[PDB]
Design a protein around this ligand. Sequence first.
Ligand SMILES: [Cl-]
Ligand SMILES: [Fe+3]
Ligand SMILES: [Fe+3]
Ligand SMILES: [Fe+3]
Ligand SMILES: [Fe+3]
Lengths: 200, 200, 200, 200, 238, 238, 238
Amino acid sequence: PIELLPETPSQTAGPYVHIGLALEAAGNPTRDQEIWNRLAKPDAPGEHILLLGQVYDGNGHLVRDSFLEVWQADANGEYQDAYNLENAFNSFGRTATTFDAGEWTLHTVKPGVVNNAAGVPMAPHINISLFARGINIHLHTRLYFDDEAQANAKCPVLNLIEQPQRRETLIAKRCEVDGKTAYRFDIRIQGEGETVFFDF
Amino acid sequence: PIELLPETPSQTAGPYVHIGLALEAAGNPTRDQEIWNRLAKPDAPGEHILLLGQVYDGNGHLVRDSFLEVWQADANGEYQDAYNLENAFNSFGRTATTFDAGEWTLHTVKPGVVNNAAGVPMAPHINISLFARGINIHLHTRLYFDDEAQANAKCPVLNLIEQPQRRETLIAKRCEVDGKTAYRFDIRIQGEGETVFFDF
Amino acid sequence: PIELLPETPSQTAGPYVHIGLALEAAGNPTRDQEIWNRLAKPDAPGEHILLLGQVYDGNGHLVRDSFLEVWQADANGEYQDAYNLENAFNSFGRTATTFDAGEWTLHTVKPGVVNNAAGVPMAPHINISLFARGINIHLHTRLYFDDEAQANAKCPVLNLIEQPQRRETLIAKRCEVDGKTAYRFDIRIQGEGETVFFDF
Amino acid sequence: PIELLPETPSQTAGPYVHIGLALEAAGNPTRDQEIWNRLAKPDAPGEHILLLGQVYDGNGHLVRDSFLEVWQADANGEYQDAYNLENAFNSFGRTATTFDAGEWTLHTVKPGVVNNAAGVPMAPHINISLFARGINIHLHTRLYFDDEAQANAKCPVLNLIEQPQRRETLIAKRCEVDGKTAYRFDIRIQGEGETVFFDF
Amino acid sequence: PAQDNSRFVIRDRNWHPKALTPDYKTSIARSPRQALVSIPQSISETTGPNFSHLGFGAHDHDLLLNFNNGGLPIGERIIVAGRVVDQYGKPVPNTLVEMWQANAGGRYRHKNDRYLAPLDPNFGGVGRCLTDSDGYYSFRTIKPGPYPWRNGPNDWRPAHIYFGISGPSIATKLITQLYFEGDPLIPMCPIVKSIANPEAVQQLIAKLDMNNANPMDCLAYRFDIVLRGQRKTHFENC
Amino acid sequence: PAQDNSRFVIRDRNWHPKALTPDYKTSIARSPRQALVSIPQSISETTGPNFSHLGFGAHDHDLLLNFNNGGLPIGERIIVAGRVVDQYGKPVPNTLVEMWQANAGGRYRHKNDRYLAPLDPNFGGVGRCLTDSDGYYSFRTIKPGPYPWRNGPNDWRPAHIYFGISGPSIATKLITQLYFEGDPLIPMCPIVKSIANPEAVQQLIAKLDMNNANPMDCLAYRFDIVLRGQRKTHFENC
Amino acid sequence: PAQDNSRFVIRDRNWHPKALTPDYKTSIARSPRQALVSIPQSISETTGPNFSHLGFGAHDHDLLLNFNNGGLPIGERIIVAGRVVDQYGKPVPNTLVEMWQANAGGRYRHKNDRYLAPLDPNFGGVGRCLTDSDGYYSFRTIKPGPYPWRNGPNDWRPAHIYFGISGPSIATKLITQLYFEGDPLIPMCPIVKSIANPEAVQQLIAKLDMNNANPMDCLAYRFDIVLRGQRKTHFENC
Ligand SMILES: [Cl-]
Ligand SMILES: [Fe+3]
Ligand SMILES: [Fe+3]
Ligand SMILES: [Fe+3]
Ligand SMILES: [Fe+3]
C-alpha cells in the first residue's frame, strides 16, 4: 500500500510544561505577548462566561500539572484563526492546573452553532486538548453545555458515543462563580465517570 | 554501557513454600533450629508487642498460603544481623498464613528510630517481604505504627509516597489482645486500599 | 550526523591549462571577450599599480606553467562582482606564468580596506588562487603590501598566522618599473620561505 | 602468537597540560603539595647544578607549551623512588616551557654513575620525557654532560647511536647562570640538529 | 474566519506511544481505560490558530540571550534547526514552534525541580519561533543535561528538549521530545520506550549537523518534524 | 557592490585529493609542506565574479564549429551536458563553466605537446558556457583520446575533459577532470588516484546518456557538478 | 632505593598514534624525522617514582568541591572510575592518576583559552588520585563540553578528559585522552584519528556505567587503563 512519511511521534509534555507554555502559571517572568486564558475582551459579541474545572487521575486524585488548549467558535459560530492579542475574540486559548491552583479557568463567550461536514448542526462546544506528565499523547475531548439540552440530544458528534451514560461526561454544568455565569467541566482521565476522549 | 552479570531471575515461591521455609506452619516435623516468628524472648529490652494481619488478593479474598519475612531494628534502633536462637532479640523473623490459620502473627518489640543515609530519622518501621503462589517476585513493604503519628508525618520514606491516602495503607492499628499491646497490619495486594509496595 | 551531497573533487589543471583559461598566454587565438590581467582601465579611481611575481617549486626552480586568479576590492574597499569588459574596474582577473614569460603581471589599483565579518578592518589585500600541473587542489593566498606596515600589523587574518616569520611571506615588495609604482609578490610552494596558504 | 591485552593508546597532552600537571606554570593556584622542578634540597649530597633549555620545532621556532618529566640517579648513583616533598633528594621532577618562560629550568645535583643490565657503567645522565601539543606520544631522550667526555665516549647507551654527529645532540653544555654551575640542554624535535629520541 | 477545506491523514496510534506504558509509572493512573471514540473531521478539527500576528521578541528564539542576567549561560553552545513538513513532504510555513528544556546540568527553572544540580543565573530554558515561508525554524541554546527522576530507583532522562508545534489545525498539533545523536541513555529510558517501534524512536533523535555550525562558536543539531498529511476534500456529500 | 550574506560548507580535504600524492610525480615538489592556515569566511572569500554580462561568441560551447578550417573534426561526436548544484541540492544558475581537452588522438593544441598523434586542423579543444536559469550547461565536442605522459614509464591518461566552474564565490571555484564511463584506464591513473576515496573518483565519471543523444548524429554524456553548500549567516557577532 | 628487577613488554607503536599525523596540523612540525633509537631496558628505564608518600588533599579527586567559590559547578554530575592493570591483567596499585579538563561549555581555566563559552566560577577542572590496593581510582566531576579549535576551518574536539598515569616505571608512564560513549564527534576528530587502528580508538571511549551511579545524584562512566605488561627478568647475562 501507499506509505507516506511517518508522523513525528508524540511524547509526554512532562512536569515542567508550564515553563514553556504557561509562563505565568509556572511563576516565571512573561514575555510581552503570551497565549493564555482570556479569549474574549469585554467588548466581544455574545454571552460572556467563565469555564473552570479540575482534572482527576484513575485513583480519584487531582492532576496538579495539566496543560489544556482550547479551540471554539465565536458567538456568531465563526472560528477566529488569526491569533492576535488585540482581537476582541480569539478562538484559541491555553490554561493549566498547578500546585497552587488545581482548578483551571478560561474566560470566553458561549460558542455559536457550527455545522459538521454533512451540514448537520453540532451543539455548541469547545474543543479541548489535555496534556500532562503521564499522558504520552494528548487527549481530545469536547465541552458541551447543560443548558443546550435540545441541541445536545441532536448533535451528530455526541450521537457517535454509543452509551447515553458516557455522553453525560461531556456536559458542563451551569453554575455561578462570584455571581457570574460559569460552567464547570471536570475531566476524569480513567475509571469511574471516565470522560469520553476522541480520535480524529 | 557497562553490563554486569545478570541477577538470577525470581520465580514464585509456589503453594508449598511452607514445606521448605515454614515447617511447623506446613504441619511437618521441624529440625532442631528453625527461623520463626518470635523475634524477642521475654527478657529483651523494649516494648513487647504482638503483630498480626491478614493478606487479601484483588478480589478481596483471603490469601491462605502467604510467607512473610521481616527485618527490624531492636528497641535501641540498631539492626542485629548475628542470627542466633539463643539471642534475647533477633532482627529477622518469618511468619505465614495457612489454611488452618489465615492470620499471621509475630512476637517482637517495637523498633527504635533509625536514620536514613542522609541522616534524617525514619519513623519506627518493620521491613516486610511478601511471597506466595501468584507472586512472581516478592513484594516489599513497611509496617509503621498508628501511635507514632508525629514521627510518621516526618518520615522521609513515607514522604516519598505522593498521595496521603496511600501512606495510610502502611500504618498498623493499635489494639489489645488478651491485655497485651498489639497492632494489626493487613495487606491488600491489589485494588481498593492496595498496600504501597517499594522498589529499592 | 547530517551528510550533504559531497562536493565534486578537485583535480590538477594540468600542463595545458592556458589553452582553456589563458588563451593569449597559450599562444592561441583569442575570442572577442577574454578574462585577463587588466583589472583597471586608465581612468579607474585609485592608485594605479603594477603587480608581478615568479612562482617556485620545492627545489627552488621556476614554475613555468602556473595559472593565477585574483579577487580584490576597488580603491574604495568594495568588491565589484558584475564582471564586464566595459567597466573601468573589475575586481576579478587572471594571469599566468609560461615558458616564454616566467613572471606573471597584473595591472590594477591598490585595494581599499575591507572589514572582516566581526567588523574589524583587514589590511589591503588581493586574494589569489594558484593552479598548475602537480597542484591537485588550488592553493589560496593573499598578497599584502609592504607600505601598509601599520594596517598589516593589525590585520585579523595576518594575525591568525602563528609565526611572525611566516607572515612576511605574504608581504609584496614595492619598487618602480619604468617610473610606475609596482610590487613584487613571489610565491614559494614548498620548503624554505614557503608561502602561507589558507583554508576557508 | 601470544597476544596480551593491548596497552591504552597515547594521545597528545594538549595546549593546557599545565592546568593538570604544572599548576604554578599555568598561573593557577597550587595545592599543598606539587611535583615540580626542585629535586634537591640545599643539604642534598653531591654537586648542586641548574639545568635549563629551550625546545624547538622543525621550523626552528620555540615550543612555548612543552611539559617535561625527568628521572635521574642521586649523586651516589641511587634512584630515589619514594617520592616525598620532605626528601633531601627526589629522583623525579617536572618542568615546563610557557608563554611567559620559554626556557625550562630544573634544580638538581649531578647524577652518579649507574650500570646497565650487563654491568657496564653508563655515563652520568638524566632521563627525560617530553610532552606537548602536537606530540602524539611522548619523546624519550637523555641529557649527558660535556665535562664527562671520557665516560660519555664509553657509554653503552650512547654507543647505540650509530653516528657520532647524532651523539652530540645529547651532550649538555656547561655554563653559568647568575654565576652558578649550570648545563644547557636544548632539544630540537625535528630537522637540523634533531635530538636523538629513544624507544625502550 | 477559518474554513473547512482540508482533511488530515488519520494518526497511527501504534506509531505514537500508547496511553498505558506501565514502565513509565505515571502513565498507569493517567491513561484512559475506555477506547477513544472516532469522529469524522469537521471544521472544528480541520482548523486551528495561526500565529503570524503574534508579536515575537527579538530574542524569543535565542536562549543564550533571552534570560540575560550579566553573562552567557554555561554549557555546550548549539543551534537546533530543522524543517516542519507534512506527511506528503509539503513544508508547513508560518507555524508556531515552541521549545523548553533544563540547563547544562539537567536543572529546570521551575519551583518543583529540587535536583541538586544548580540553576544557571543566565539560562531560562524557553524558546519560540515561527517557521519561515519554506518551513524552517532555528533556536540557539545550550545542550541540556540528563537528570534523574523518581520512576525506577536509578532512572535518568537522556538529554532532551521539549517541542510543541501547532501546524495548520488542532488535528496536527503535537508535543514531543527531541533527543541527541548517540546518547547512551536513550535505549534505557521508559519514556522513550513508551514508543513501541524502534524506527519511530529514531525520528526523535536530532543529528549532529556540522554543515550548519558556526566555526569557533557553536555546534548545530538538525531536527525535522513531520505533521499529519493534509489533502483537499474529495467526493464528499455526493 | 557584492555583499557578505552567505557562508559555504567547509571543504572535506580528505574527499578532494591531498597535495602530496607521490605516485603523481609532479606533486612531490609542488605540495606545501606546512599546514594550510584556516581563516574565517569574510566578504573577501564569500563573494566572487558573476559573468552574466561576459559576451560569449555563438560557437563558444560548440567545439565542432569553433575551430572551423574547412571541415568537421574527426572523432566521436558527443554532447557533454549536466547540472551545476550546491551540496544542498540548490541549482547554480548563470555560472561560468569552462572546459578544454585534447583531440580524438590525445593531442593538445599547445606548442608544448609533441605527442606524435597528429593535430586535427578542424579542432581546437576549448569551450565555455554560462549555466542557464535552472543550472544546466551543455557542450558539443568530440570524445578526447587518452595519451601517454612522462610519469611512470608506461603511464597513460584516460580520456578526459578539464572543467572549471566559478560558482557564487571564490570559495566555490573549482577545477576538475571529467572521465568517461567504463574507461579501463581510470583505475590505473595516478592522477585519478590522487583521490583516496573510491566513491569520490566515481563522482568524476560521466555516464553515457542515451536519452540526451541526437539519433543518427551524436551520443551524449552526463556530468553533474556539485559545489560547496551555500547557507545564510546565522547568530554571528551576537 | 629502586632496583632493576623487571622488564616491560615493548610498545606497539602502530597501536599508539604515530608522530606524524598531518591532519592534526601541529604534529607536522613537532614530529621527529629520524627513527627512534632502540635501547635495552636498564635500571634507568625499569624504575620510576612511587607516589604513596605524596600528600593528597581531601578534595583532590573531587572536582565538584576542589574549586569551591560559593556554589556547585554547572553541568552533568558524573563519577569517572576504573581500574589500572597491566597487559598481563595484573592490577597496578598505589599509582598516580592525574586528570584535567574543560568545563561544561568546553572552556579551560587557562589564560590562553579565549573561547567565548564562559568560565564557571565553581569549576577548576583538575584532579588526582592514587589507585587503591586493587588498582581502582575514581573522580567526581562534571562532563566537559566539546569545543572548537584552530585546526581545519570547522574542527571540534569531542568532549574529553586528559589522563596521566605513572605506573611502576618511567617506561610505563602514559598520557592519553578519555572520550565518552556515543559522542558523534569522535569519528570526525583528527586527534582521535592520529590512532590508525579503530580498535585502539575504542579503548579510549569511557562507557556509561549505571551500576556505579548515585541515584538521584550523579551518573558514572567507566574507564579502565592498561599499562605495559611487567615481568621478571629471566636468563639474562648467561
Ligand atoms: Cl528541479
Ligand atoms: Fe518528561
Ligand atoms: Fe510454583
Ligand atoms: Fe592533467
Ligand atoms: Fe588536545
